[PDB]
Coordinates of C-alpha atoms and ligand atoms in Angstrom, one line a residue:
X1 CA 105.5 98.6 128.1
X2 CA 103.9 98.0 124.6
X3 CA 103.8 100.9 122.1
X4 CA 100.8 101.3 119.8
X5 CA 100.9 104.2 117.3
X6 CA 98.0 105.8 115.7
X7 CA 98.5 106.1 112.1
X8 CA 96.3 107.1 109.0
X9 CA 95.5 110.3 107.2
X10 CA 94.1 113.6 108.3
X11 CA 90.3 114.1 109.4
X12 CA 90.4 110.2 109.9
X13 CA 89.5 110.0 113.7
X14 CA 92.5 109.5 115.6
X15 CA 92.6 111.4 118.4
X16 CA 88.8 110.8 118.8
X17 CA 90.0 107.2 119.3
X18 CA 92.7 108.7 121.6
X19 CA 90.4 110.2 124.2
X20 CA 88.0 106.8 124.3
X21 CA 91.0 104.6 124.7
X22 CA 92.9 106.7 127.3
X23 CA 90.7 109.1 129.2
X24 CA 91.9 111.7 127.6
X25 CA 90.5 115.4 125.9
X26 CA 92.8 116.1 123.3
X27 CA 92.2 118.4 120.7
X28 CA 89.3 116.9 117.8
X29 CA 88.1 118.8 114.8
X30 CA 86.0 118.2 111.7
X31 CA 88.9 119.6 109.5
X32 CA 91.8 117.9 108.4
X33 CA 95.7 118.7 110.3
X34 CA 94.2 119.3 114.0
X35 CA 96.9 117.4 116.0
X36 CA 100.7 119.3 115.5
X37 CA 102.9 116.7 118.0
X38 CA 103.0 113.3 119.7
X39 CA 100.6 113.2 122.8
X40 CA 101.1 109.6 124.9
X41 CA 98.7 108.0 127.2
X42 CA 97.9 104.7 128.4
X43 CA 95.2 102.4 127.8
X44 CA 92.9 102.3 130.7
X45 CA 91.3 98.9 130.3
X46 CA 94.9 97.3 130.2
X47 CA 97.5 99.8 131.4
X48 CA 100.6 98.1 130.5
X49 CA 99.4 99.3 126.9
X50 CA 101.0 103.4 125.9
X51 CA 98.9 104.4 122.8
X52 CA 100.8 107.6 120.8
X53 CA 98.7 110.0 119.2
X54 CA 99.9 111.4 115.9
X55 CA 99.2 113.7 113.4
X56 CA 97.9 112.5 110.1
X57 CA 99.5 111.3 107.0
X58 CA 98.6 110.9 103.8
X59 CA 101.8 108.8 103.0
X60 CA 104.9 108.0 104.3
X61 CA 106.6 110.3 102.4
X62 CA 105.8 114.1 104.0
X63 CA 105.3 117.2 103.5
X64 CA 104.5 119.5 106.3
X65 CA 106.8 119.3 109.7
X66 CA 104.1 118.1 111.3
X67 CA 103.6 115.4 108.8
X68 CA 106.9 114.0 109.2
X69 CA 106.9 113.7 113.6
X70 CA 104.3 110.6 112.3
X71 CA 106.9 109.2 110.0
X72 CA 109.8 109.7 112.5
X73 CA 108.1 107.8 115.2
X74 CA 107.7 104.8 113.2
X75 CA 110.9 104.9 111.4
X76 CA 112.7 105.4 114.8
X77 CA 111.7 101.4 115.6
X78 CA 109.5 102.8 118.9
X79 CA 106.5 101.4 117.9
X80 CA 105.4 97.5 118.4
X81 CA 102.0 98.1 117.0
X82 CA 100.7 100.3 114.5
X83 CA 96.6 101.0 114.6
X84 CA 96.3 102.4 110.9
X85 CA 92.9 104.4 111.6
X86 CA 91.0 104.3 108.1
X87 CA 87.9 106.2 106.9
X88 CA 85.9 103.9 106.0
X89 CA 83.4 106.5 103.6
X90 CA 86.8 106.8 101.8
X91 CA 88.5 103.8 101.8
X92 CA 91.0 104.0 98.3
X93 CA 92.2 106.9 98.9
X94 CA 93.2 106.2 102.7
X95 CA 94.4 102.2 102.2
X96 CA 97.5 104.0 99.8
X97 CA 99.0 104.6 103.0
X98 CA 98.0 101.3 104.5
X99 CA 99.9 99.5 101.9
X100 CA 103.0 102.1 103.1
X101 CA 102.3 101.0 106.6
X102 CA 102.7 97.2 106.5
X103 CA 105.6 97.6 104.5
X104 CA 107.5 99.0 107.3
X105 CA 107.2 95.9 109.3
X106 CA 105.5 96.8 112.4
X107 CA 102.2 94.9 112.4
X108 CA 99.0 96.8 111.7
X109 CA 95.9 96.3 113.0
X110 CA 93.1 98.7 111.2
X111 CA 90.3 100.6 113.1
X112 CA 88.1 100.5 109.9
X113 CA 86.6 103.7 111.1
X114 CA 83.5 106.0 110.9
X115 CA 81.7 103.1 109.5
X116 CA 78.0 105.2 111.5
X117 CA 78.6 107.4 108.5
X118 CA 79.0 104.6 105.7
X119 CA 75.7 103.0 107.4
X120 CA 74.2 106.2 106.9
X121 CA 75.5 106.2 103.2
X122 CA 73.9 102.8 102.5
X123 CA 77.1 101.1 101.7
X124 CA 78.8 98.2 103.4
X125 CA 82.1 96.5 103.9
X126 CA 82.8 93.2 104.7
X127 CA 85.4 93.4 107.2
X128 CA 86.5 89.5 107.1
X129 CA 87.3 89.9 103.3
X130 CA 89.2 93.2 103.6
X131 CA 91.3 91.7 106.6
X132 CA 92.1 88.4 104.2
X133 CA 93.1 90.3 100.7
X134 CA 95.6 92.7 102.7
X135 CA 97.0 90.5 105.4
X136 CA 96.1 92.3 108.3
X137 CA 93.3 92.3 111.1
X138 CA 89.9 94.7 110.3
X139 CA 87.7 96.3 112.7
X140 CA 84.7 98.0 112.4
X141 CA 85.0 101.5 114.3
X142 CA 83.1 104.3 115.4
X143 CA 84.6 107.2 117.9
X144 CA 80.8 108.7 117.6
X145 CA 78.6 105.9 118.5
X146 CA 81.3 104.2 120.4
X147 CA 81.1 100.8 119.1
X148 CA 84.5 98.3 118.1
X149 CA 87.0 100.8 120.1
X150 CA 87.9 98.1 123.3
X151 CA 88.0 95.4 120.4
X152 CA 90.1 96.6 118.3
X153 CA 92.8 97.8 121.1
X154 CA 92.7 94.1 122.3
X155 CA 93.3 93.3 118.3
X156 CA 96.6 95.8 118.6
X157 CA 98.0 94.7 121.7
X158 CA 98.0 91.2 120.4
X159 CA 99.1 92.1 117.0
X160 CA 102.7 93.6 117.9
X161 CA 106.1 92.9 116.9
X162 CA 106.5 90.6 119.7
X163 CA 103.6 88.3 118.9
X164 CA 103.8 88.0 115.3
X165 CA 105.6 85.3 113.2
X166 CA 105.9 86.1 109.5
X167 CA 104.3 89.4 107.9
X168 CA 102.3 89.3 105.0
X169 CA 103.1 91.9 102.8
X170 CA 101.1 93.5 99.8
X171 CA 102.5 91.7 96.5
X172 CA 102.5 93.7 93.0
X173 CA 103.5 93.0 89.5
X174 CA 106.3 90.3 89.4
X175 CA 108.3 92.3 87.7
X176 CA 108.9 95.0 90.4
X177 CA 109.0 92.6 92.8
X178 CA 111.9 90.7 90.9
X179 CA 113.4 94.6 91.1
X180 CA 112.4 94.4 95.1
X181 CA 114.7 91.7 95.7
X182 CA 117.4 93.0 93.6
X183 CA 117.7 95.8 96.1
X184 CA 117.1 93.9 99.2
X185 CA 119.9 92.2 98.1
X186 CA 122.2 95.7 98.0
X187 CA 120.5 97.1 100.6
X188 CA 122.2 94.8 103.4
X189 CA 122.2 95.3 106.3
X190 CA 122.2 99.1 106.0
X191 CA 118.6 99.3 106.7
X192 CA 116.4 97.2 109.7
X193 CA 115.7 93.9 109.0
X194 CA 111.8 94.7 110.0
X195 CA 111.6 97.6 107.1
X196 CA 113.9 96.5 104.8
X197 CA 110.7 96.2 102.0
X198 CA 109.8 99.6 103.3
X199 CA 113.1 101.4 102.0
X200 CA 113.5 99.6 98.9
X201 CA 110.6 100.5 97.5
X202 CA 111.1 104.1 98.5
X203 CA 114.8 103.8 97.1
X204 CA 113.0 102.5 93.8
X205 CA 110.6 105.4 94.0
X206 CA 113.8 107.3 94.2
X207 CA 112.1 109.5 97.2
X208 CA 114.7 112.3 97.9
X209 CA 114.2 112.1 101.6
X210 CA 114.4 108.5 102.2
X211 CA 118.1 108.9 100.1
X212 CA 119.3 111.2 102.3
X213 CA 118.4 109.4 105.3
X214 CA 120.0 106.2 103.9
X215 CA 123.3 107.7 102.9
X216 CA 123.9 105.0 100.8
X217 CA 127.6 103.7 99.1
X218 CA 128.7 104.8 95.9
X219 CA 128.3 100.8 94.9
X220 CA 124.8 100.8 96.4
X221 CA 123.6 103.7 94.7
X222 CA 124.6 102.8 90.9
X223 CA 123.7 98.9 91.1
X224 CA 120.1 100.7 92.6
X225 CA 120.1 102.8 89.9
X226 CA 120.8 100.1 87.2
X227 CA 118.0 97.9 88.6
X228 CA 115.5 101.0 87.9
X229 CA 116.6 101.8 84.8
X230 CA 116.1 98.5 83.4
X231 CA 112.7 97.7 85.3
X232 CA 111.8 101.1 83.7
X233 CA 112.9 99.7 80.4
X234 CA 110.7 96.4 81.1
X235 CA 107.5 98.3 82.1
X236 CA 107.9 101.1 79.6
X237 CA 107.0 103.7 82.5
X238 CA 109.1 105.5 84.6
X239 CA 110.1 104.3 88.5
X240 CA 107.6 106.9 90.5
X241 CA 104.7 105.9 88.4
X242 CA 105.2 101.9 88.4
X243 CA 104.9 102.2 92.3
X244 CA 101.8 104.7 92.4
X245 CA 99.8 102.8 89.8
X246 CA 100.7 99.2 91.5
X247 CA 99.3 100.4 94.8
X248 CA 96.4 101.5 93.1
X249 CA 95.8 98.5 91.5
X250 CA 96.7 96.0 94.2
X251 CA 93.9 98.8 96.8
X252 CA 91.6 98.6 93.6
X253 CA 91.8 94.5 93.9
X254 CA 91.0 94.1 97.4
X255 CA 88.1 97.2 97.4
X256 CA 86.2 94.6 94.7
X257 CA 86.4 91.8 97.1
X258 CA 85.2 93.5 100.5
X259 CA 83.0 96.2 98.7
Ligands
GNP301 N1 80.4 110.2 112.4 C1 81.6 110.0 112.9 N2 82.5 111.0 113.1 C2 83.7 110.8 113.6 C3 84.1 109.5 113.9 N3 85.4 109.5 114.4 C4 85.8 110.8 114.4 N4 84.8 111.6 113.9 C5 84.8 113.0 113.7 O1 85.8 113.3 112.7 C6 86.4 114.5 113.0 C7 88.0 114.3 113.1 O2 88.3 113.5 114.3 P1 89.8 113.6 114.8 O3 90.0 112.7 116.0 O4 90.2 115.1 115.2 O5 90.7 113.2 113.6 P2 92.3 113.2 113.5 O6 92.8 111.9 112.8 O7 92.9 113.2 115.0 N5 92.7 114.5 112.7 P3 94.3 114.8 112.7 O8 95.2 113.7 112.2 O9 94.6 116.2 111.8 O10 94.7 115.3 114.2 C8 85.8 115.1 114.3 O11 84.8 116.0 114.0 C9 85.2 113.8 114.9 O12 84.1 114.2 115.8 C10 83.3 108.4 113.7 O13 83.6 107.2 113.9 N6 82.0 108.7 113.1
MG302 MG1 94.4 114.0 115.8

């Protein structure tokens, strides 16, 4: 039984993409934070597929209870696939959880969604590029006009943690990375192998939740906290905003070379 999770912000289509791919009638609405749990169903073209819906995210690091079942489902290792559903009219904004996503080592596949509405707006995307520049496969989706849903389910299936090698992931400034390995290093073994980069950068970010989660030695947490302080020192900006601003700039990047 292969597990594919359906990931990606509020208001971005998910469940609409649910309903297609399973059968189902779950609850869709034109307002962001519609879905409040996990609904499973499988995928009727090839039923050895489950597909989860989720509610949405705007990162991996939550706010409302609902919020966080999305983040507990992938951070629980149930997942072999994840299908990061994108809004393709605001693509920026929604790819800062993308970068999040492949970080956590489950391969994504993206459903570049509600790309009716970008045809609409004039603008296009060139899905080939954006799948090169961030590592992971692209397709064009629309729950409305019902066009790239059975391909990118076939993408998924076949993008899962048993059929992929080596994941790709997002590469910033050199000098965070030089920090990133610095606490892979500490980190161990305390952490899954699979989202190891995941929880360093978080532990850089020095997210309160992921912390407490961790529950990390007394060693752990002051040679983590002497890596930050001096890779604060070297950027001259503080931990939470080197991360922010390097996401940013490494979404900003690949935008340029698919817009
Ligand atoms: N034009 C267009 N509209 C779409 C497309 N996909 C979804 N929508 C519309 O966008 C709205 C949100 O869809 P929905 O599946 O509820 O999104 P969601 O990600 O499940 N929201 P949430 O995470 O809060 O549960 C609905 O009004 C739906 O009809 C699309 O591809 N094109
Ligand atoms: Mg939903």
């Amino acid at each position: 039984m292969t597990e594919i999770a359906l990931i990606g912000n509020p208001n971005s289509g998910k469940t609409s993409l649910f309903n297609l791919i399973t059968g189902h009638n779950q609850r869709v609405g034109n307002w962001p934070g519609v879905t409040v749990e996990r609904k499973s169903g499988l995928v009727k073209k090839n039923k050895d597929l489950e597909i989860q819906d989720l509610p949405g995210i705007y990162s991996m690091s939550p706010y409302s209870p609902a919020e966080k079942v999305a983040r507990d489902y992938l951070l629980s290792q149930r997942a072999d696939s994840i299908l990061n559903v994108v809004d393709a009219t605001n693509l920026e904004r929604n790819l800062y959880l993308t970068t999040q996503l492949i970080e956590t080592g489950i391969p994504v596949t993206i459903a570049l969604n509600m790309i009716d509405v970008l045809d609409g707006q004039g603008k296009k995307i060139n899905v080939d590029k954006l799948s090169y520049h961030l590592g992971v496969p692209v397709v064009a989706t629309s729950a409305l006009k019902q066009t790239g849903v059975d391909q990118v389910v076939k993408k998924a299936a076949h993008t899962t943690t048993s059929t992929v090698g080596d994941l790709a992931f997002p590469i910033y400034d050199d000098r965070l990375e030089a920090a990133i390995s610095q606490i892979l290093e500490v980190l161990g073994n305390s952490v899954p192998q699979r989202s190891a980069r995941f929880y360093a950068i978080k532990l850089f970010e020095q997210d309160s939740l992921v912390e407490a989660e961790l529950d990390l030695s007394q060693f752990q947490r002051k040679e983590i906290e002497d890596i930050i302080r001096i890779t604060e020192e070297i950027f001259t900006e503080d931990a939470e905003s080197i991360v922010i601003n390097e996401r940013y700039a490494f979404i900003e990047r690949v935008c340029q070379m698919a817009e």
